[PDB]
Amino acid sequence: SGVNNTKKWKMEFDTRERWENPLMGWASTADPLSNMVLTFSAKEDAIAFAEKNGWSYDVEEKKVPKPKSKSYGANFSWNKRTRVSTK
């Protein structure tokens, strides 16, 4: 339920082949540029950083959760339909 990994603007890159090393069973690659996390602080700065190196950025926006009303007593209504069971 912890959410500190949010508040940031990681800019990982796409993935490419990860073949199986036929000797050991190991996994190996060609693209060194795959494990390339980068922590930013605002989206307006990220595009400025990637455009500054010409890379075809592809943004996804924030997904803010709503502020929800959760009233404990409404679990225990006379009229209504939220009458919980098992306390």
The whole-angstrom separation of Cα 10 and Cα 37 is 6
Task: Decide: is 24 part of the binding site for another protein (CB under 8 A).
Answer: no
Task: Decide: is 39 part of the binding site for another protein (CB under 8 A).
Answer: no
Task: Decide: is 81 part of the binding site for another protein (CB under 8 A).
Answer: yes
The whole-angstrom separation of Cα 2 and Cα 74 is 27
Number of chain positions touching another protein (CB under 8 A) = 37
SS3 content of the chain, % helix, strand, coil (to 5): 15, 5, 75
Contact (Cβ atoms closer than 8 angstroms) between residue 41 and residue 16: no
Q: Of 53 and 86, which has the nearer Cβ to another protein? A: 86
Q: Of 12 and 45, which has the nearer Cβ to another protein? A: 12
Find the binder of another protein among 39, 53, 56, 69 (CB under 8 A).
69
Contact (Cβ atoms closer than 8 angstroms) between residue 67 and residue 61: no
What is the contact surface with another protein in residues (CB under 8 A)?
A: 1-4, 15, 17-20, 27, 29, 35, 60, 63-73, 75-87
